[PDB]
């Protein structure tokens, strides 16, 4: 449709960076969600924001903004995801901030196709670039290297040849 999330796995594993967006602050600490796993909630309690103790907490945190967080926990049947800001280190910031801008991109491109031929994003993603993405890393170096290498495309098997025309085509151009 018009979103979806960016890897195959729904759950984002123990010490991955994820990129996040508070959404609020509250007593506890900060509500946040996971921008590149469709939007699921992430919390980070107060302890795990910094060193200090804020008590004046929308000093440190900007509500709105992006920002970046290792996982600590992840509980399945609640759907529960324990974060931290504290614990990245600068190196972190800067390694998952590339990620997630290729990461951002691949799926812009997808979802152009997902609207113009009319068809669900999640599929795109289970027949193109998770694939494409589980050969070379990631998708959106595939998309580089197609541009001078029609061999990658190979096995991928489109839900119509027709899309996957219109995407070699719209990697092209820009």
């Not at 999330?5 to 729904?10: D, I, L, T, V």
């Not at 910094?50 to 004046?56: H, N, P, T, V």
């Not at 170096?141 to 990658?152: G, H, M, Q, R």
Request: charged residues 35%; glycine residues 4%.
């Amino acid at each position: 449709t018009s979103h979806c999330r960016f890897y195959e796995n729904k759950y984002p594993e123990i010490d991955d960076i994820v990129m996040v967006n508070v959404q609020q602050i509250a007593e506890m600490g900060a509500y946040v969600k996971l921008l590149e796993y469709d939007n699921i909630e992430g919390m980070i309690l107060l302890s795990e924001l910094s060193r200090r103790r804020i008590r004046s907490i929308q000093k440190l945190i900007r509500v709105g903004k992006n920002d970046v967080a290792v996982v600590l926990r992840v509980d399945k049947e609640k759907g529960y995801i324990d974060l931290s800001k504290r614990r990245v280190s600068s190196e972190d910031i800067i390694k998952c901030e590339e990620k997630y801008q290729k990461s951002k991109t691949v799926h812009s491109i997808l979802r152009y196709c997902a609207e113009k031929f009319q068809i669900p994003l999640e599929e795109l993603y289970k027949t193109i670039a998770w694939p494409l993405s589980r050969k070379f890393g990631h998708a959106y170096e595939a998309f580089k290297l197609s541009i001078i290498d029609e061999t990658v495309w190979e096995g991928i098997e489109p839900p119509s040849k027709d899309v996957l025309d219109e995407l070699k085509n719209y990697i092209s151009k820009r």
